[PDB]
Amino acid sequence: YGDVTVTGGISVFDAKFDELYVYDGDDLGAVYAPEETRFRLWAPTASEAFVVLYETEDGMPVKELPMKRDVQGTWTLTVAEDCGGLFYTYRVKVGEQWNEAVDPYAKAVGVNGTKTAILDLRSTNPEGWENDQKPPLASPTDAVIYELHVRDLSIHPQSGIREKGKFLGLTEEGTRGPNGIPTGLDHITGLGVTHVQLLPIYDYSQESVDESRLDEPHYNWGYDPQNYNVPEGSYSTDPHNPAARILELKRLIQKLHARGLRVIMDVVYNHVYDGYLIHFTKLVPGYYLRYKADRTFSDGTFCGNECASERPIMRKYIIESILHWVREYHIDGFRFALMGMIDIETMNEIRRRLDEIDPTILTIGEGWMMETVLPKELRANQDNAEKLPGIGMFNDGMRDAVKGDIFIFDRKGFISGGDGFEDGVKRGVAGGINYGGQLRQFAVEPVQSVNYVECHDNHTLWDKIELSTPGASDEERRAMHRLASAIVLTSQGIPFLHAGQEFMRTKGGVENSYKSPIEVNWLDWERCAAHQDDVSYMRSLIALRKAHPAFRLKTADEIRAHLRFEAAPPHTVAFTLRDHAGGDPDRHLYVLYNANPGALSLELPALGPWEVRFGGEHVLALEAGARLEVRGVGVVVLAVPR
Numbered sequence: 001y002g003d004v005t006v007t008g009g010i011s012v013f014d015a016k017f018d019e020l021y022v023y024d025g026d027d028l029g030a031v032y033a034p035e036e037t038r039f040r041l042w043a044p045t046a047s048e049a050f051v052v053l054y055e056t057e058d059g060m061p062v063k064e065l066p067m068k069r070d071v072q073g074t075w076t077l078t079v080a081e082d083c084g085g086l087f088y089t090y091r092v093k094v095g096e097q098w099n100e101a102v103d104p105y106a107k108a109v110g111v112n113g114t115k116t117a118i119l120d121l122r123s124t125n126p127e128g129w130e131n132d133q134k135p136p137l138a139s140p141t142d143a144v145i146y147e148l149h150v151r152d153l154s155i156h157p158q159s160g161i162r163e164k165g166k167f168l169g170l171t172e173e174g175t176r177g178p179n180g181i182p183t184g185l186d187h188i189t190g191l192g193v194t195h196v197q198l199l200p201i202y203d204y205s206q207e208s209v210d211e212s213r214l215d216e217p218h219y220n221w222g223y224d225p226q227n228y229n230v231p232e233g234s235y236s237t238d239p240h241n242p243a244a245r246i247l248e249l250k251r252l253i254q255k256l257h258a259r260g261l262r263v264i265m266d267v268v269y270n271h272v273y274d275g276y277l278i279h280f281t282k283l284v285p286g287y288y289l290r291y292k293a294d295r296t297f298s299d300g301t302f303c304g305n306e307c308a309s310e311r312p313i314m315r316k317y318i319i320e321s322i323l324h325w326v327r328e329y330h331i332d333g334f335r336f337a338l339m340g341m342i343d344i345e346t347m348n349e350i351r352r353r354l355d356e357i358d359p360t361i362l363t364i365g366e367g368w369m370m371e372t373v374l375p376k377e378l379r380a381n382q383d384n385a386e387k388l389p390g391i392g393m394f395n396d397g398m399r400d401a402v403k404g405d406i407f408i409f410d411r412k413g414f415i416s417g418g419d420g421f422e423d424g425v426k427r428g429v430a431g432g433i434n435y436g437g438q439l440r441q442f443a444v445e446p447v448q449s450v451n452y453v454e455c456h457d458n459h460t461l462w463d464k465i466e467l468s469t470p471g472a473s474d475e476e477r478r479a480m481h482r483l484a485s486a487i488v489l490t491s492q493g494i495p496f497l498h499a500g501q502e503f504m505r506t507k508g509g510v511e512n513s514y515k516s517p518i519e520v521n522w523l524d525w526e527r528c529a530a531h532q533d534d535v536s537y538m539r540s541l542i543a544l545r546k547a548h549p550a551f552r553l554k555t556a557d558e559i560r561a562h563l564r565f566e567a568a569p570p571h572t573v574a575f576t577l578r579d580h581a582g583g584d585p586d587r588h589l590y591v592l593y594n595a596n597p598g599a600l601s602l603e604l605p606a607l608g609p610w611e612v613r614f615g616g617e618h619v620l621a622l623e624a625g626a627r628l629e630v631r632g633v634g635v636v637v638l639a640v641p642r
């Protein structure tokens with residue numbers, strides 16, 4: 001951990017270390033120009049530091065230059081020759097140990113991320129990149145998220161996409177699949193979703209996907225971070241060419257924006273893929289990651305380590321990393337893996353730094369309550385959401401109430417006939433806010449509640465239903481599935497959909513498919529071709545939400561003012577959104593979630609001449625008390641016209 005004489009007697013573990021070496025510059029890394037390249041490395045506990053230069057990604061050094069000790073724990077060096085096309089690493093001696101690492105501020109790397117690449121990053125911008133414009137977004141509750149893996153999207157043999165498994169595969173328009181159905185980008189833009197959330201597209205570890213063996217089967221979600229500030233090599237057409245993955249990701253984002261879609265990056269700042277080998281511990285051992293009392297890794301992540309976001313240089317790394325994805329790649333939002341492992345101060349400064357640039361940039365995360373050496377009152381989780389204004393959190397209470405518990409596989413939920421889940425559904429209809437009485441969750445405002453019944457984790461909705469409806473036919477399970485999706489899209493808050501949920505995606509019952517083959521993980525376009533009715537259904541639900549601002553209320557005060565739950569029997573939920581809620585064109589809406597297969601009659605509130613808006617196929621009678629008779633599991637939406 002180092003010669004503790006170099007750092008004023010104070011160890012990397014004492015609390016007086018932090019305020020000592022707080023570098024105030026935003027110039028860490030290397031800045032290339034033809035005249036010179038300047039390097040700055042933060043490594044306060046090292047005795048020596050060298051820049052090592054390479055001509056080829058897997059060559060031997062051509063120069064090995066010593067760096068000068070500089071201010072606030074940093075080392076500098078200027079090289080007064082055109083270093084374009086060169087690769088480099090940092091070699092440091094920490095105590096009596098030498099290690100050679102990639103630059104933590106690497107913005108480009110060679111294959112598998114072991115050497116930093118020097119290049120003019122403005123040569124990676126696609127044509128017109130400076131003219132890139134974002135689709136409008138007035139409120140987070142106006143977003144419809146679609147969670148997608150780059151490999152899943154196109155790797156099925158019948159996807160009809162040329163660059164299968166690649167960033168460029170999501171740039172291709174006009175692709176067709178079995179029976180000529182639209183696939184890929186056209187299928188996604190055809191749905192009406194507004195944001196594509198991509199599973200890890202930063203550079204994840206070689207042990208997960210080896211970028212030199214892409215000619216053999218491979219698959220991994222990528223939750224194993226290696227280089228935080230550069231794209232994953234296996235999604236490029238050429239992982240050996242350091243510029244290719246950058247240019248190709250930018251082409252992807254530019255095209256999505258041009259087609260009306262925004263891009264959310266799944267980011268993992270809570271843990272690295274290997275606390276022993278990552279560059280953080282090579283360069284400053286004992287700083288960037290969290291430690292138990294015995295100076296072993298705190299392991300709240302169940303992955304091996306935790307990043308010490310609360311320490312100032314690590315908070316600065318995370319924030320400069322995010323601002324890099326925003327500024328260099330034009331990213332529109334971030335989903336924070338295990339946000340409950342990150343401290344509140346870091347999350348709020350992130351929200352602030354983004355708001356300074358563009359408040360429509362999204363920040364959502366997993367606010368789970370989880371043990372770690374990070375103090376309980378400092379965790380950015382649902383318990384502390386009052387301290388995290390404007391940050392959305394996955395609403396697991398809503399998820400479990402709708403489809404049934406994710407950990408006990410056979411337990412039913414509201415859609416599958418379970419008893420007593422109506423209040424759980426109502427709590428998420430209200431956007432997870434403090435609505436009143438028993439109707440309360442963690443959110444202060446509905447922008448803090450992300451509604452979902454499916455994501456990449458755990459069984460798919462279809463697979464969950466299959467595990468918990470032993471006496472249900474296939475048609476019955478389809479109706480349950482459809483009802484679950486309708487609840488997400490008609491609840492206050494931020495609706496979130498899993499790619500392929502529109503065609504009842506299955507993983508053959510695999511619960512945790514993170515390294516399962518493409519046969520398990522691909523978007524199955526043959527299944528999608530067999531489920532075009534259900535895709536149309538999902539497309540129409542998304543259109544219904546878009547056509548009604550009353551479903552997207554911006555504040556908890558509006559929800560408390562305009563949302564009212566109505567008389568309804570067990571296994572149903574009924575509510576109204578009254579008096580042009582949020583400027584809705586209709587005067588009132590009435591919404592019915594029916595989980596009963598049979599027929600039933602409801603007395604509608606006396607709000608005016610009701611008219612059908614959605615789900616007419618379930619309506620046996622609508623008569624002006626005013627009466628509605630329906631049959632079958634699903635949603636019915638009525639309106640009192642203006």
Ligand SMILES: OC[C@H]1O[C@H](O[C@H]2[C@H](O)[C@@H](O)[C@@H](O[C@H]3[C@H](O)[C@@H](O)[C@@H](O)O[C@@H]3CO)O[C@@H]2CO)[C@H](O)[C@@H](O)[C@@H]1O
Nearest residue numbers: 221222223224301302303304336337338366457512514
């Ligand atoms: O080899 C490292 C690591 O692999 C396995 O952990 C993986 C999980 O099993 C897998 O579900 C996935 O977990 C991530 C969630 O999907 C994601 O939503 C995110 O928020 O965080 C989770 C990771 O923290 O990926 C991990 C990492 O690959 C295995 O179970 C571990 O024991 C093993 O250390």
Ligand SMILES: OC[C@H]1O[C@H](O[C@H]2[C@H](O)[C@@H](O)[C@@H](O[C@H]3[C@H](O)[C@@H](O)[C@@H](O)O[C@@H]3CO)O[C@@H]2CO)[C@H](O)[C@@H](O)[C@@H]1O
Nearest residue numbers: 301302367368369370396397400406407457458511512
């Ligand atoms: O080995 C520990 C644990 O790992 C796995 O749990 C993961 C879940 O699959 C994943 O959904 C998420 O779980 C969170 C729930 O979604 C949320 O409702 C609430 O319960 O917090 C949970 C996290 O604490 O992340 C965990 C990560 O461990 C696996 O499925 C479990 O069986 C296993 O016990």
Ligand SMILES: OC[C@H]1O[C@H](O[C@H]2[C@H](O)[C@@H](O)[C@@H](O[C@H]3[C@H](O)[C@@H](O)[C@@H](O)O[C@@H]3CO)O[C@@H]2CO)[C@H](O)[C@@H](O)[C@@H]1O
Nearest residue numbers: 532533534535536537538539540541613614615616617
């Ligand atoms: O557009 C509003 C409309 O959306 C929903 O209707 C969809 C059906 O639920 C879905 O099964 C599908 O059904 C149609 C077939 O695609 C088509 O081949 C033909 O058979 O007509 C079917 C019935 O319309 O697509 C529709 C349209 O998206 C919702 O159920 C309706 O209540 C709603 O009015």
Ligand SMILES: [Ca+2]
Nearest residue numbers: 203204205233
């Ligand atoms: Ca990689």
Ligand SMILES: [Ca+2]
Nearest residue numbers: 359389390391
């Ligand atoms: Ca905000």
Ligand SMILES: [Ca+2]
Nearest residue numbers: 466506508509
């Ligand atoms: Ca099955």
